[PDB]
Design a protein around this motif. Structure first.
Motif, PDB file in Angstrom:
ATOM      1  N   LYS A   1       0.824  -1.201   0.000  1.00 44.14           N
ATOM      2  CA  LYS A   1       0.000   0.000   0.000  1.00 44.14           C
ATOM      3  C   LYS A   1       0.859   1.252   0.000  1.00 44.14           C
ATOM      4  O   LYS A   1       0.499   2.257  -0.620  1.00 44.14           O
ATOM      5  CB  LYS A   1      -0.935  -0.001   1.199  1.00 44.14           C
ATOM      6  CG  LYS A   1      -2.083   0.972   1.090  1.00 44.14           C
ATOM      7  CD  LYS A   1      -3.281   0.316   0.434  1.00 44.14           C
ATOM      8  CE  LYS A   1      -4.455   1.277   0.332  1.00 44.14           C
ATOM      9  NZ  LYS A   1      -4.698   1.999   1.611  1.00 44.14           N
TER      10      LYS A   1
ATOM     11  N   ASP B   1       3.764   1.122  -1.411  1.00 46.15           N
ATOM     12  CA  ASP B   1       4.176   1.024  -2.804  1.00 46.15           C
ATOM     13  C   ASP B   1       3.044   1.435  -3.731  1.00 46.15           C
ATOM     14  O   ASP B   1       3.284   1.895  -4.850  1.00 46.15           O
ATOM     15  CB  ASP B   1       4.633  -0.402  -3.115  1.00 46.15           C
ATOM     16  CG  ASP B   1       5.474  -0.491  -4.378  1.00 46.15           C
ATOM     17  OD1 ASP B   1       5.856   0.565  -4.923  1.00 46.15           O
ATOM     18  OD2 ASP B   1       5.748  -1.623  -4.827  1.00 46.15           O
ATOM     19  N   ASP B   2       1.803   1.284  -3.278  1.00 45.70           N
ATOM     20  CA  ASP B   2       0.698   1.833  -4.045  1.00 45.70           C
ATOM     21  C   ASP B   2       0.705   3.349  -3.951  1.00 45.70           C
ATOM     22  O   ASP B   2       0.904   4.033  -4.956  1.00 45.70           O
ATOM     23  CB  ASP B   2      -0.632   1.254  -3.552  1.00 45.70           C
ATOM     24  CG  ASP B   2      -1.795   1.502  -4.515  1.00 45.70           C
ATOM     25  OD1 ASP B   2      -1.630   2.219  -5.527  1.00 45.70           O
ATOM     26  OD2 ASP B   2      -2.883   0.940  -4.271  1.00 45.70           O
ATOM     27  N   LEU B   3       0.585   3.891  -2.738  1.00 44.65           N
ATOM     28  CA  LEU B   3       0.272   5.307  -2.593  1.00 44.65           C
ATOM     29  C   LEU B   3       1.476   6.183  -2.882  1.00 44.65           C
ATOM     30  O   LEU B   3       1.366   7.411  -2.906  1.00 44.65           O
ATOM     31  CB  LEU B   3      -0.262   5.584  -1.198  1.00 44.65           C
ATOM     32  CG  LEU B   3      -1.225   6.756  -1.082  1.00 44.65           C
ATOM     33  CD1 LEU B   3      -2.480   6.440  -1.860  1.00 44.65           C
ATOM     34  CD2 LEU B   3      -1.541   7.043   0.370  1.00 44.65           C
ATOM     35  N   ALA B   4       2.639   5.579  -3.110  1.00 42.68           N
ATOM     36  CA  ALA B   4       3.748   6.340  -3.658  1.00 42.68           C
ATOM     37  C   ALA B   4       3.422   6.831  -5.058  1.00 42.68           C
ATOM     38  O   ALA B   4       3.837   7.926  -5.448  1.00 42.68           O
ATOM     39  CB  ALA B   4       5.019   5.492  -3.667  1.00 42.68           C
ATOM     40  N   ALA B   5       2.643   6.055  -5.807  1.00 40.84           N
ATOM     41  CA  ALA B   5       2.438   6.352  -7.217  1.00 40.84           C
ATOM     42  C   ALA B   5       1.548   7.570  -7.405  1.00 40.84           C
ATOM     43  O   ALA B   5       1.745   8.352  -8.337  1.00 40.84           O
ATOM     44  CB  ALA B   5       1.847   5.137  -7.932  1.00 40.84           C
ATOM     45  N   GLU B   6       0.579   7.766  -6.523  1.00 42.28           N
ATOM     46  CA  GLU B   6      -0.257   8.945  -6.679  1.00 42.28           C
ATOM     47  C   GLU B   6       0.470  10.202  -6.240  1.00 42.28           C
ATOM     48  O   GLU B   6       0.041  11.309  -6.571  1.00 42.28           O
ATOM     49  CB  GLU B   6      -1.579   8.812  -5.913  1.00 42.28           C
ATOM     50  CG  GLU B   6      -2.500   7.681  -6.370  1.00 42.28           C
ATOM     51  CD  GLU B   6      -2.253   6.374  -5.653  1.00 42.28           C
ATOM     52  OE1 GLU B   6      -1.094   5.925  -5.625  1.00 42.28           O
ATOM     53  OE2 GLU B   6      -3.220   5.799  -5.115  1.00 42.28           O
TER      54      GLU B   6
ATOM     55  N   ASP C   1       3.929  11.090  -6.866  1.00 42.32           N
ATOM     56  CA  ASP C   1       4.751  11.668  -7.920  1.00 42.32           C
ATOM     57  C   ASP C   1       3.959  11.828  -9.208  1.00 42.32           C
ATOM     58  O   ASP C   1       4.420  12.484 -10.148  1.00 42.32           O
ATOM     59  CB  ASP C   1       6.010  10.828  -8.155  1.00 42.32           C
ATOM     60  CG  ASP C   1       5.726   9.343  -8.229  1.00 42.32           C
ATOM     61  OD1 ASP C   1       4.555   8.946  -8.076  1.00 42.32           O
ATOM     62  OD2 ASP C   1       6.681   8.567  -8.442  1.00 42.32           O
ATOM     63  N   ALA C   2       2.773  11.223  -9.279  1.00 42.82           N
ATOM     64  CA  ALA C   2       1.841  11.616 -10.322  1.00 42.82           C
ATOM     65  C   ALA C   2       1.381  13.042 -10.097  1.00 42.82           C
ATOM     66  O   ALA C   2       1.414  13.864 -11.017  1.00 42.82           O
ATOM     67  CB  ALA C   2       0.644  10.672 -10.363  1.00 42.82           C
ATOM     68  N   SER C   3       0.979  13.357  -8.870  1.00 42.81           N
ATOM     69  CA  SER C   3       0.509  14.701  -8.580  1.00 42.81           C
ATOM     70  C   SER C   3       1.650  15.691  -8.614  1.00 42.81           C
ATOM     71  O   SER C   3       1.462  16.844  -9.011  1.00 42.81           O
ATOM     72  CB  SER C   3      -0.185  14.741  -7.224  1.00 42.81           C
ATOM     73  OG  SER C   3      -0.572  16.062  -6.899  1.00 42.81           O
ATOM     74  N   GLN C   4       2.842  15.257  -8.216  1.00 40.48           N
ATOM     75  CA  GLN C   4       4.007  16.126  -8.277  1.00 40.48           C
ATOM     76  C   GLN C   4       4.342  16.481  -9.714  1.00 40.48           C
ATOM     77  O   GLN C   4       4.790  17.594 -10.003  1.00 40.48           O
ATOM     78  CB  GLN C   4       5.189  15.454  -7.596  1.00 40.48           C
ATOM     79  CG  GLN C   4       5.130  15.558  -6.109  1.00 40.48           C
ATOM     80  CD  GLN C   4       5.237  16.977  -5.668  1.00 40.48           C
ATOM     81  OE1 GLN C   4       4.265  17.572  -5.220  1.00 40.48           O
ATOM     82  NE2 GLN C   4       6.417  17.547  -5.816  1.00 40.48           N
ATOM     83  N   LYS C   5       4.109  15.551 -10.635  1.00 37.05           N
ATOM     84  CA  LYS C   5       4.158  15.913 -12.044  1.00 37.05           C
ATOM     85  C   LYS C   5       2.958  16.765 -12.408  1.00 37.05           C
ATOM     86  O   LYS C   5       3.095  17.788 -13.084  1.00 37.05           O
ATOM     87  CB  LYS C   5       4.221  14.661 -12.911  1.00 37.05           C
ATOM     88  CG  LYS C   5       3.707  14.845 -14.321  1.00 37.05           C
ATOM     89  CD  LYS C   5       4.114  13.694 -15.218  1.00 37.05           C
ATOM     90  CE  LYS C   5       3.687  12.352 -14.646  1.00 37.05           C
ATOM     91  NZ  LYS C   5       4.219  11.215 -15.447  1.00 37.05           N
TER      92      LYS C   5
END
Lengths: 48, 48
Positions: free
Chosen positions: A24, A26-31, A33-37
């Motif tokens: 999780k 490892d899941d919520l890391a993805a949202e 740096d998506a938002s950071q982009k």
């Protein structure tokens, strides 16, 4: 001995729950740096 | 008394090591929605 049997039964159970929150994070890391982009890609337009 | 003190030393560790996640999700959750909030409030101003 009784403290040991009280230990390992809740111990060797709880590691199977550990693997989920490993995923999780490892899941919520993805949202993140998506938002950071998704953050700076707009400011580099909105300043432009 | 070897195993009994050896068992809790592992058992007290995983008691806290889930908490080392159970801040980390709520920290990243409190970081995300805060960071996504400014990610939106820019994106309104692109439109107008």
């Amino acid at each position: 001995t009784a403290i040991a049997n009280a230990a390992e039964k809740k111990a060797k159970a709880i590691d199977k729950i550990i693997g989920e929150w490993k995923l999780k994070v490892d899941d919520l890391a993805a949202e993140l740096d998506a938002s950071q982009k998704e953050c700076r890609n707009y400011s580099t337009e909105l300043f432009r």
